[PDB]
């Protein structure tokens, strides 16, 4: 047994639940690289930058991160969210994947498949 918070959150959103709030949006130039997870805010014109810990489902729910080491890849970093998705940064980071080659979100900036 283990609690599936990731699945529980996705299921709650499909039910019409209000997304997790108070993710920390930063002031920035919006002229950054647009990479997904960075040491400093890197939003481009199509993105918002957020403090990473505040958009991590596991940090925010006070539950273990699901990898044997319990490391968090968001805490202490900044996450770039497409502005059209910025009402639910937790859900967005949960549901999406970063390209290991260029560092953009798959389907939101990664063009490695062209």
């Amino acid at each position: 047994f283990a609690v599936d918070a990731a699945k529980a959150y996705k299921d709650y959103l499909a039910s019409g639940g209000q997304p997790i709030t108070n993710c920390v949006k930063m002031l920035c130039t919006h002229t950054g690289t647009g990479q997904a997870i960075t040491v400093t805010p890197e939003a481009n014109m199509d993105q918002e930058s957020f403090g990473g810990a505040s958009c991590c489902l596991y940090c925010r729910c006070h539950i273990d991160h699901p990898n044997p080491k319990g490391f968090c890849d968001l805490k202490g970093k900044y996450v770039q969210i497409p502005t059209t998705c910025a009402n639910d940064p937790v859900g967005f980071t949960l549901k999406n994947t970063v390209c290991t080659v260029c560092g953009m979100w798959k389907g939101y900036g990664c063009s490695c498949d062209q």
Binding site: N22, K25, L27, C28, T40, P41, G51, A53, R60
Partner: protein, 296 residues
């Protein structure tokens, strides 16, 4: 006009007065600044504080050490810590702390009363946003407050590196006479009001470049009265203008020299370097922190 600045610092002539303490009655009491869409008050407030700190002679060594007290919020997150982490050079060691649990971007977080926090090492910058809303009691005399202010005064004197700086949040009722006196132990000091929160009696008491001894004698009861007098007679127009230009925000990594010195070797030439933001005096060992836990 001051509306394009990140905030307003207490003018020198107000510091030199000898006022009696009055009630703070702010003209712009009911105004609120227009924040950029979706930006939290405290992200805006810390951004303007850091923008102002960019204009001072802060020492910025490699492997800078910063501690942030009062970093939690009723939202369970740490907006100010996220701004500090943005502002500070990459690799800066940032520790934060609060009475109540919260989720943080800091390298390490301690939960508990600040009086329980101990650190082996000295720090290059101390930020405090600690505040107890209970202090706002307009029906009793507005006296110097102890509580966490006592802790902060001792922490500065024992754990701030020479050459280091502080920014400590105060308000009309949340203040301490010894903290003002301690500002005379820095090369320079001010009380800074952010433009986004200028309708509040809040300020940050900023001490720039710690010298470890009084360079000027400050009576803290008088200087708080001077601060209130300034606020009472100088309405500050609410403004978020400086939040829209973020191009020069990051703190410049100056690579400030760090040396260990005995007290005997702090000569006038060393004092001069400290006063210019050109030297930090502390050890460079490992950073070790702890929180005391009371067992039943």
């Amino acid at each position: 006009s001051q509306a394009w600045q990140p905030g307003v610092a207490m003018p020198n002539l107000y510091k030199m007065q000898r006022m009696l303490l009055e009630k703070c009655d702010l003209q712009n009491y009911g105004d609120s600044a227009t924040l950029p869409k979706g930006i939290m008050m405290n992200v805006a407030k810390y951004t303007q504080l850091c923008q102002y700190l960019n204009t001072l002679t802060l020492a910025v060594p490699y492997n800078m050490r910063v501690i942030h007290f009062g970093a939690g919020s009723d939202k369970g997150v740490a907006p100010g810590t996220a701004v500090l982490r943005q502002w500070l050079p990459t690799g800066t060691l940032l520790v934060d702390s609060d009475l109540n649990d919260f989720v943080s971007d800091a390298d390490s977080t301690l939960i508990g009363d600040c009086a329980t926090v101990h650190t082996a090492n000295k720090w290059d910058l101390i930020i405090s946003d600690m505040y107890d809303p209970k202090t706002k009691n307009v029906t009793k005399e507005n006296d110097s407050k102890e509580g966490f202010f006592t802790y902060i005064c001792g922490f500065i004197q024992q754990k701030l590196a020479l050459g280091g700086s502080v920014a400590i949040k105060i308000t009309e009722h949340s203040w301490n006479a010894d903290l003002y006196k301690l500002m005379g132990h820095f090369a320079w000091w001010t009380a800074f009001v952010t433009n986004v929160n200028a309708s509040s009696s809040e300020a940050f008491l900023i001490g720039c470049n710690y010298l470890g001894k009084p360079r000027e004698q400050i009576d803290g009861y008088v200087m708080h009265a001077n601060y209130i007098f300034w606020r009472n007679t100088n309405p500050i127009q609410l403004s978020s203008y400086s939040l829209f230009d973020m191009s020069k925000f990051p703190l410049k990594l100056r690579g400030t020299a760090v040396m260990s010195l005995k007290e005997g070797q702090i000569n006038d030439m060393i004092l001069s370097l400290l006063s210019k933001g050109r030297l930090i005096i502390r050890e460079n060992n490992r950073v070790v922190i702890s929180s005391d836990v009371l067992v039943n």
